[PDB]
Design a protein around this ligand. Structure first.
Ligand SMILES: Nc1ncnc2c1ncn2[C@@H]1O[C@H](COP(=O)(O)OP(=O)(O)O)[C@@H](O)[C@H]1O
Ligand SMILES: Nc1ncnc2c1ncn2[C@@H]1O[C@H](COP(=O)(O)OP(=O)(O)O)[C@@H](O)[C@H]1O
Ligand SMILES: Nc1ncnc2c1ncn2[C@@H]1O[C@H](COP(=O)(O)OP(=O)(O)O)[C@@H](O)[C@H]1O
Lengths: 659, 392, 110
């Protein structure tokens, strides 16, 4: 319980660095730079360099995906660490590449791939190990085949590497490029629960033989058709170590009740014959078409053979079924009940923070440039799902191919070489490919996190007591923000969640006037979209559409009933905005619907930005058009092309016509 | 990298004039009027007259569709130019017409077709070449069969042309009247992207064997039912050099799940057996009727056999599928996703500038008059697509 | 034109919005915007027009311009930030260039 560490995820995806807690390293006589022997299971062991990282837990150790596969261990297992002082540098180490990775790529694995790996990098060696080198639009696994000083060699600039030879084979070594948790970004929190409910029925299939508890059995994934579904299940079963069969919807419908009734039974029989079963019902929208009263006799039996095959079967037999649909409202209601799909999982469009991680993952095999600032691209990529974030990663890597052809001609079948690596991908390959931009998820209810500073407010002493830490031993839950326009009513609730650390949903009046108003309308889709997100603030601007001048005066009443009931939720709040508080029906003001009213001294301080092309105030006070005078001041950019930034003589020309 | 020029499109569709950059011609000791020997690939070569056009790029050369086919090269290839001073005029050159072009047309190929071609036109000759003459509502290809001064003759008013003979055959010479980029007008900019994403999976099928990048695989054409769809894909595969199978929607629906399930599989298997595959799903509106909850069991399987046949197949196997519909909102949403039809292309009605180019293309085999000002017609032709521009 | 019978989200209204989305850059001019007021989906399509206008601010390379003559019955919703952010009216009678100078025959006093 003191040396027994639990393997965890790696902050840095390095095959040699494993991070640990320093107070635990203070117990086991270790500091940075020293090497440690780590043996996990099946008598296998490797050896790596430690580091003092206080981020990890005390009884937990950080291990990388390739470090995990070398010990024949997987995440959630206990490993033992031993001090390794008896180690010395090595003379010769023979490195052969792996068969399943040298696909057409040729040249010299040492000059292109292996040199940058070990250049000034001091790394330990095993006699029988495998490892991955990400470079040149791909990744070629290598194998250590010999070790000169016993089995614990250490590479250094003083080392002779005879990489000459044949592509060695692999032996029960799962592809180190297979899907993993380090390959799924933008849904870290979404992976928390899915990894808290499949962690036991798959990794610990012991208690579930002798416990009367009914374990989770029916998982229902949903989200965007663009991305975020197949990998959520692929990165789990391929990483947790579970048998993975993914039944595709379109194939089943391609029969005449032949492989429609068989593959449904057979794959349900096949997955159960193995102990860890993960069944991915891809395109369940095509199989289950909600309550389709007008259809053919095959959909009335392909869904009729599915429910009976999961309530009778899939009962403590260590089988976790996983559905996948574009919308959780186009499949039969009898799918989500008890035992079958009682679990549901939201896959939302990645926020600005989540877009950056997935950008990193896919942009790893490439060699980029320092002018490339993927952070700036990670901001202006709303409406972009993991597919489109990978779709431009192709058009960004492929634009570098034609733009740098030139001398290379008469391409051989295996012409790739060191030219493939070091292929610097300029930022223009992004911009020109992003010039033909094409997003997908634009009409969606976006879940994200506000990244705006509270300094740019200049308010009127907003009482801090309009907040709570969910620690009490009833509280008001309805507030509205009215007053003049521009004073801050739109950006007001944005900076509140900056300190509260909660998701937000910006909704407008005519947004609820969606043609898809025919109870679980978008109105209720938006309500329940923020129900899973806990806590979540529902901001509503343009609420002036409450009055008159079909379902004209409807949707309001529709909005009314849904507001109540949320008072028991406690961890959810509703805020609105308006400018003409007269034509609004006073219904919302009623207790429960809303329970507070906030207006909007003198002109307050306001924090600007863009302080680089700036040039050096409160007297002008003698917001409304705060940004309007700012952008026009930047628009007054002197074009004396044939130094100057901002100036005063340009302000006086702006207030001549403003209002 | 200095003599290696990249072939490009021709501003003038002349079989003998090839334009180049003058600063590059300043490097290689050349000015207007002089002749150059251009050998491309497969040891084949011709010879043409250059000209000083600053419009082309420095490392790029302008070549016409017929100039391109004679060197067995296609656009996007590197050719080598050599100075050809050792050339002289010719005495006799025998010109026979091509079999696939003398269809019913008769009379005298010299008095009608060959004379206006060489009247005051000084053009070089190869011993084995083919060329096209646009005239008289059609176009009849001709073949040079002999060359009196070695293999580099030059025609002139002083030349004896015995055109008397039989219609010679053709041999692996693609129809010089086949569809090309010079036959598609009004959508030049629309062709820019479609030629920036199929240029690699078809012309350079090398890296896509050893690169983890997922290339473009699903192209979704759309626009008007009148025009602008079949040629956008015909002018690419027939010009880039790709196998071209066009599955028509109406034929598939004409079965009883016989050739409905077979031709879908078989043509998807057939196109993959060849390396450059361009699949045109014509009338995909008829095959995929959006999300049709009220229909028969055949549309629920002909679209169910298509999606499974493109996400499992059509994966780095050098296959570019191309859909074609009247509206991009009458087909299933599961068609456009990831890998399948993630690319989409707009074909709009040609603007007043685009209407004029397509008018020129079709009005070439004709002999017009100087009172005909196709520019004035090119203005008042809104609501006219390439079909109606060809219908009149 | 937006009052097309084919108003039943991806109506012609949204077909027109996305038609100019591929074309980059593209200017969306809108005349006859005086149909905003009253006198079914009568007062609709406006709200439909409202939601689609926002979001285009991140596009950066797209602009929206409108036209009207009676700026009173127009719901002030569009004037809100993001939907619209500038107002332009329309000295004396200015010079105007004519054409058809061939069948012409040879002013400002009029
Ligand atoms: N959340 C994510 N994180 C990282 N990559 C992703 C994510 N979602 C999608 N991708 C990438 O997008 C590609 C296609 O998305 P996919 O998961 O097939 O869509 P779906 O599962 O919704 O059909 C995948 O190959 C994957 O690499
Ligand atoms: N302290 C501030 N208060 C209000 N607005 C500010 C402040 N500082 C900057 N602004 C700018 O003024 C704008 C006012 O919000 P806006 O989007 O116009 O919505 P509304 O006009 O409906 O309140 C913001 O977009 C913001 O960019
Ligand atoms: N963009 C274009 N440029 C030149 N010619 C065109 C164009 N579009 C159509 N045409 C002409 O119109 C004829 C018929 O149009 P077609 O391409 O068959 O229509 P679609 O492909 O939309 O069914 C073709 O033979 C072609 O010559």
């Amino acid at each position: 319980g003191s040396n027994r560490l639990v393997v965890d995820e790696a902050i840095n995806d390095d095959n040699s660095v494993v991070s640990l807690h320093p107070a635990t390293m203070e117990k086991l006589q270790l500091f940075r730079g020293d090497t440690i022997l780590i043996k996990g299971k099946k008598r296998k062991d490797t050896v790596c360099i430690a580091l003092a990282d206080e981020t990890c837990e005390e009884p937990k150790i950080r291990m990388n995906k390739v470090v995990r596969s070398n010990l024949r261990v997987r995440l959630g297992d206990v490993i033992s660490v031993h001090q390794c002082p008896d180690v010395k540098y090595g003379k010769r180490v023979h490195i052969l590449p792996v068969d399943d990775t040298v696909e057409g790529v040729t040249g010299n694995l040492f000059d292109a791939y292996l040199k940058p790996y070990f250049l000034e990098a001091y790394r330990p060696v095993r006699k029988g190990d495998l490892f991955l080198v990400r470079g040149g639009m791909r990744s070629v696994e290598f194998k250590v085949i010999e070790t000169d000083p016993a089995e614990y060699c250490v590479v250094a600039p003083d080392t002779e590497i005879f990489c000459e030879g044949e592509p060695v084979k692999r032996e029960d070594e799962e592809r180190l490029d297979d899907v993993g948790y380090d390959d799924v970004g933008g849904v870290r929190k979404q992976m928390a629960q899915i990894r808290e409910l499949v962690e036991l029925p798959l990794r610990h299939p012991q208690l579930f033989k002798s416990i009367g508890v009914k374990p989770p059995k029916g998982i229902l994934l949903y989200g965007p058709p663009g991305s975020g579904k197949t990998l959520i299940a692929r990165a789990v079963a391929n990483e947790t170590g579970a048998f993975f069969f993914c039944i595709n919807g379109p194939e089943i419908m391609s029969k005449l009740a032949g492989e429609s009734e068989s593959n449904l039974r057979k794959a349900f029989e096949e997955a159960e014959k193995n102990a860890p079963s993960i069944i991915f019902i891809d395109e369940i929208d095509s199989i289950a078409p909600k309550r389709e009263k007008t259809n053919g006799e095959v959909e009335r039996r392909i869904v009729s053979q599915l429910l009976t095959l999961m309530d009778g079967l899939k009962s403590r037999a260590h089988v976790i079924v996983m559905g996948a649909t574009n919308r959780p409202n186009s499949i039969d209601p009898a799918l989500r009940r008890f035992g079958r799909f009682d679990r549901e999982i939201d896959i939302g469009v990645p926020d600005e923070i989540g877009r950056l991680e997935v950008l990193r993952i896919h942009t790893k095999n490439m060699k980029l440039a320092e002018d490339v600032d993927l952070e700036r691209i990670s901001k202006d990529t709303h409406g972009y799902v993991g597919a489109d974030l990978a779709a431009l990663c192709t058009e960004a890597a492929l634009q570098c191919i034609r733009e740098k052809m030139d001398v290379i001609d008469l391409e051989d079948d295996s012409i790739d070489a060191e030219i493939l690596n070091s292929m610097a991908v300029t930022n223009e390959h992004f911009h020109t490919a992003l010039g033909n931009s094409n997003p997908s998820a634009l009409r969606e209810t976006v879940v994200e996190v506000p990244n705006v500073s509270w300094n740019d407010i200049g308010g009127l002493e907003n009482v801090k007591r309009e907040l709570q830490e969910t620690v009490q031993y009833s509280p008001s839950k309805g507030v509205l923000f009215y007053g003049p326009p521009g004073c801050g009513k739109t950006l007001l609730a944005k900076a509140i969640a900056n300190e509260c650390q909660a998701n937000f949903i910006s909704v407008k009046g005519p947004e609820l006037l969606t043609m898809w108003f025919g109870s679980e309308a978008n109105v209720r889709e938006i309500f329940d979209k923020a129900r899973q997100s806990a806590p979540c603030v529902l901001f509503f601007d343009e609420l002036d559409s409450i009055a008159t001048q079909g379902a004209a005066d409807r949707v309001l009443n529709q909005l009314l009933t849904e507001m109540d009931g949320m008072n028991a939720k406690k961890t959810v709040f509703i805020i609105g905005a308006t400018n003409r508080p007269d034509i609004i029906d006073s219904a919302l003001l009623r207790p429960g619907r809303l329970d507070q009213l906030i207006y909007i001294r003198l002109n307050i301080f306001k924090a600007a930005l863009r302080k680089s092309p700036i040039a050096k105030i409160g007297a002008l006070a003698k917001g409304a058009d705060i940004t309007e005078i700012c952008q026009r001041a930047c628009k007054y950019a002197i074009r004396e092309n044939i130094v100057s930034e901002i100036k005063a003589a340009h302000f006086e020309e702006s207030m001549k016509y403003a209002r």
